[PDB]
Amino acid sequence: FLPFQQFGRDIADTTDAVRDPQTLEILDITPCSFGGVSVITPGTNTSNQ
Amino acid sequence: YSNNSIAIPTNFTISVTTEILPVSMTKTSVDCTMYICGDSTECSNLLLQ
Numbered sequence: 318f319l320p321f322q323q324f325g326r327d328i329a330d331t332t333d334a335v336r337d338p339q340t341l342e343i344l345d346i347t348p349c350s351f352g353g354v355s356v357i358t359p360g361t362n363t364s365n366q
Numbered sequence: 367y368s369n370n371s372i373a374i375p376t377n378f379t380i381s382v383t384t385e386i387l388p389v390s391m392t393k394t395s396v397d398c399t400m401y402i403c404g405d406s407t408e409c410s411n412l413l414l415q
């Protein structure tokens with residue numbers, strides 16, 4: 318950051334980085350979630366694998 | 367134009383040309399609960415309407 322800047326924003330205009338007010342260091346912000354898994358099944362009428 | 371006159375070619379030419387065509391576009395996927403409420407738990411219960 319430049320010495321007078323405290324925030325950082327991404328192309329979506331949402332915050333992604335901050336400055337710690339006491340140590341003056343930069344921190345990234347990342348989501349904690351992962352819902353999009355894909356499940357391959359051969360049909361429950363045949364097996365439960 | 368006349369009524370007893372005809373024109374005939376005595377020679378020829380070989381020609382090569384091109385033609386472009388689209389076939390497919392980009393595939394995309396979406397997850398509402400991440401797009402709409404990001405990582406909030408309070409907004410999930412309201413979106414569940």
Ligand SMILES: *[C@@H]1O[C@H](CO)[C@@H](O[C@@H]2O[C@H](CO)[C@@H](O)[C@H](O)[C@H]2NC(C)=O)[C@H](O)[C@H]1NC(C)=O
Nearest residue numbers: 371372373374375376377378379380381382383
């Ligand atoms: C029919 O068309 C072809 C196309 O060019 C003629 O071929 C050219 O004719 C003379 C003969 O050597 C030269 O000016 C060129 O070298 C020939 N073509 C090439 C690619 O070299 C041919 O002469 C024509 N025929 C008549 C009877 O006019």
